[PDB]
Symmetry: C3
Subunit: 71 residues, 3 copies
């Protein structure tokens, strides 16, 4: 959602820099900061998913071991 907010902000600066191409340098540098911030937020969300996956792994493993032990 913040990712969606940084992406919508990036789409804005892209229209600006495009319409300015049709001054320009500052907006390109600003747009690179917008892209970096999106990438950084996506990395935060990706790190969460990695840990969520490991936790699911541990949970499935516990069930698998339980079923094995029940034999």
């Amino acid at each position: 959602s913040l990712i969606e907010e940084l992406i919508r902000r990036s789409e804005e600066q892209q229209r600006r820099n495009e319409e300015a191409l049709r001054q320009l340098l500052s907006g390109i540098v600003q747009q690179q900061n917008n892209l970096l911030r999106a990438i950084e937020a996506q990395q935060h969300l990706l790190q969460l998913t990695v840990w969520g996956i490991k936790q699911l792994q541990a949970r499935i493993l516990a069930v698998e071991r339980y079923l094995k032990d029940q034999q």
Copy 2:
């Protein structure tokens, strides 16, 4: 895969802008659109993974509860 297509397209424009650095402005602005589109596709795929993780969570939880209830 579309991500891989936007990334290969970004690698192309990077060589262009590099070899043009060795006109340039338009390709930098074009390359920023290539990066934004990659980021946006990656966000689509990341959103899918988030929902896939939640669904796995619900599935494991149902199994855990079943095993608990079977006692």
Copy 3:
């Protein structure tokens, strides 16, 4: 972690290009390569998570089928 290294490197070039804005073109082109490399590493990590999710799916499915078959 490499993602964190490409992102910290991107944050450096952003300060350079900002402080140079306050020559500039080369650093913008360099910064676009930094962003592309971050995006590409994130795509590698995202592809891993996708496969990790599929494998968890197969594992949960095997447990679900086992419990079904035990009836």
